[PDB]
Every structure is written in structure tokens, then in C-alpha cells.
Design a protein around this ligand. Structure first.
Ligand SMILES: CCOC(=O)CCC(=O)N1CCc2c1cccc2C(F)(F)F
Ligand SMILES: *[C@@H]1O[C@H](CO)[C@@H](O)[C@H](O)[C@H]1NC(C)=O
Length: 345
């Protein structure tokens, strides 16, 4: 029930030069806009991007995209499935740039692929202004997995873009789901830091300005790590992160009778994640082994300290205008599924 619109600026493209785009469901009465960034890993050289083109082509091209998509989870229009923002204008932005939403480079005689993630977001925002976004009160930039990291990389740029376009009244906020990773030691010895270092050069990747100025040339990969980029951001950002995220465990070379070394490794991972969220006032971090939450149909089921994620997001909304309406919800129990509300699989 979200309808595809390919970008009118056809110079803003997916990896293979096909036009990027977005799926839109408008809500006539609403001044709330939800723009969701899809995830799905990334690629960082010719060889691994070629492989992704063979077997994950929808993440590199719009040529085979369907005319519509069904909104699920926070993108559902039904209050039963989406207690939070069911009546909002909803936008799903397909991830077709393979660059963690950071790229600003075109396909050309020197570049086999285009990496335009950061420009896709900017162009979607610009084209939506003529479709009602100009009347918005709140724009929530949300995303899962690589899209969650994309929120952290792009939320302040969206805020700056709207300010420079003359829309200072639109309140830009971020919701980063499953995009808060640790550059930790692997359990056995890709290492995230090196691949992102390579990707930034391959993509012409861009990072938020204040973070860029802290880490400087050659070190901008640091800004892909939530606990380092988050303190530099000005827009309000709600962080959703499983304490034992499956993608984190994968990059850590953990594949699950757990003996002492792996037990301590997993417990330390949860402790470190919890530590990085200590001073993140709006966060939801259950002690579960899983990946992504906000566009899952059963996203309402998980609770931390008896509070669901849709409730926490509602409390966040109220805090940005609380007795029994918390926004900082981080599990303290130390092993996956010590929270009984964890997804079953
Ligand atoms: C899935 C996904 O999208 N992942 C997993 C690890 C990662 C992603 C996205 C951006 C950065 C990183 C990390 F670990 F390199 F920081
Ligand atoms: C199209 O997008 C490119 C890259 O973002 C930009 O340089 C150009 O000005 C845009 N043109 C139009 C007409 O939107």
C-alpha cells in the first residue's frame, strides 16, 4: 500500500545507474512524516560488488522493483499493528547504493558503480516537499541495520537541508534500529573497521561534519560507529539495539554447548553495548539475540521493564513537546533471552 515513485532527478541513481526512488503512502490530515531507510549490508570493492550484483540485485538496482510494497511494523497504517504512528505519512526508501547510505559518487568512466546513498536521501526529501512534506511538523528519519547506521550518518544533514531550503519549523528526528555497532575484538580472527575504511574511499563516503572534524582525514570510518558519532549529533535520536545483535556477532566471528571463553565473550559484548547506551537518553535495548525490529509485524511484542517499543517511542514524542512513560530502556540481564519477551525465531 506504499506506491513507488522513481526520482525525477534521474542523475541520483542506484549502484547500476538505474534511478533511485521511494515508496509513499500519504496521510492527508497528518503533519507527521516517517522516512524509513532499508538496510542490507554493503559492498566495498569491484569484486564483492559484482557478486552482490549477481545475487542481491534489488539492493543495487531499481530495474526489478515492484510498483507497491506493504507497510509493516512502524510502516503499517493499522493502529493494531502500529500503535505509534499509524496515521503518519509513510515513506520507505529502498537501499540500492550498498554504501551504508554514505556515498556521493556517480557511475562514470572511472567508476563501475554509483554510490549515492547520501544524495538519495537528500533528493527524496527535496521531492517530497512538493508532495506535502512542506507542511510537516515532524520528520522522523528511521532505518534498520545499514539503514539504522544511515540514520546516524544523515539525520543532521536532513535537518541542515531543510533549514537551508527555508523550512526551519520541521522538527527532524532520528530512529536508528540495529545500526549501533562496536569496533571490538573478534572472538576469532570481515573486521568492520577495515571494510568501511575501504568502502569510504570506494564510495566517496561522507560523514556528519562535527564527527568528520573530530576524527579528520583517513579516520572518518570512526563515524560509522554509533557510540562515536552519536555524541556529535544535534538532532534527537532514539537508539534501538539488541544487546546481542546477530550482525555484531557475525562480524565478531561468533557462530552458535557454549564454553567459558565464548560465554565470557558474549557477556562482555552485552556489557559493552549497555555501557555505550548509558548516556543515550532515548534508547530501547533488549537482551536478545536478534537483528532489526521496527518493520517487523510483531515489533509490538518485545518489552523492556514492561514497556514496549511503540510505547517508548510515544513517550519520546511526549518528552519532545514522565510518570510511567519511560524513554531509556536498557536490559541489565547478561545473557540472550534472559528477557522473556525476546523474539522466538
Ligand atoms: C548489517 C549491517 O548493515 N551492518 C553490520 C555491521 C555494520 C553494518 C552497517 C554499518 C556498519 C557496520 C560496522 F560494524 F562495520 F560498523
Ligand atoms: C540532481 O542531483 C544532483 C546530485 O544530487 C545535483 O547536483 C543536481 O543539481 C540535481 N538536479 C536537479 C534538477 O534536481
Amino acid at each position: 500500500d506504499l506506491r513507488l515513485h522513481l526520482l525525477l532527478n534521474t542523475s541520483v541513481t542506484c549502484n547500476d545507474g538505474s534511478p533511485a526512488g521511494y515508496y509513499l503512502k500519504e496521510s492527508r490530515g497528518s503533519r507527521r512524516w516517517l522516512l524509513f531507510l532499508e538496510g542490507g549490508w554493503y559492498c566495498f570493492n569491484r569484486e564483492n560488488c559484482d557478486s552482490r550484483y549477481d545475487t542481491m540485485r534489488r539492493l543495487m538496482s531499481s530495474r526489478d522493483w515492484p510498483r507497491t510494497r506493504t507497510g509493516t511494523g512502524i510502516l503499517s497504517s493499522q493502529p493494531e499493528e502500529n500503535p505509534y504512528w499509524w496515521n503518519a505519512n509513510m515513506v520507505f526508501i529502498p537501499y540500492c547504493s550498498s554504501d551504508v547510505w554514505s556515498g556521493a559518487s556517480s557511475k562514470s568512466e572511472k567508476n563501475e558503480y554509483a554510490f549515492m546513498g547520501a544524495l538519495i536521501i537528500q533528493e527524496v526529501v527535496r521531492e517530497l516537499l512538493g508532495r506535502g512534506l512542506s507542511g510537516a511538523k515532524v520528520l522522523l528519519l528511521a532505518g534498520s541495520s545499514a539503514g539504522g547506521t544511515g540514520v546516524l550518518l544523515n539525520v543532521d544533514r536532513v535537518a541542515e537541508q531543510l533549514e537551508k531550503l527555508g523550512y526551519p519549523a520541521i522538527q527532524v528526528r532520528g530512529l536508528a534500529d540495529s545500526g549501533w555497532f562496536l569496533d571490538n575484538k573478534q572472538y576469532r580472527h570481515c573486521a568492520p573497521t577495515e571494510a568501511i575504511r575501504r568502502g569510504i574511499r570506494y564510495w566517496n563516503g561522507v560523514v556528519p561534519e562535527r564527527c568528520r572534524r573530530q576524527f579528520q582525514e583517513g579516520e572518518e570510518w570512526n563515524c560509522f560507529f554509533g557510540y562515536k558519532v552519536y555524541p556529535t549529533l544535534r538532532s534527537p535520536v532514539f537508539v534501538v539495539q539488541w544487546l546481542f545483535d546477530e550482525a555484531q556477532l557475525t562480524v565478531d566471528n561468533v557462530h552458535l554447548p557454549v564454553q567459558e571463553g565464548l560465554r565470557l565473550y558474549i557477556q562482555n559484548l552485552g556489557r559493552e553495548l549497555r555501557h555505550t547506551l548509558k548516556d543515550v537518553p532515548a534508547s530501547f535495548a533488549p537482551a536478545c539475540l536478534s537483528h532489526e525490529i521496527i518493520i517487523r509485524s510483531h515489533w509490538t511484542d518485545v518489552q523492556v521493564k514492561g514497556t514496549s517499543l511503540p510505547r517508548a517511542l510515544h513517550c519520546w514524542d511526549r518528552s519532545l513537546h514522565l510518570k510511567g512513560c519511560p524513554v531509556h530502556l536498557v536490559d541489565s540481564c547478561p545473557w540472550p533471552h534472559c528477557n522473556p519477551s525476546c523474539p522466538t525465531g
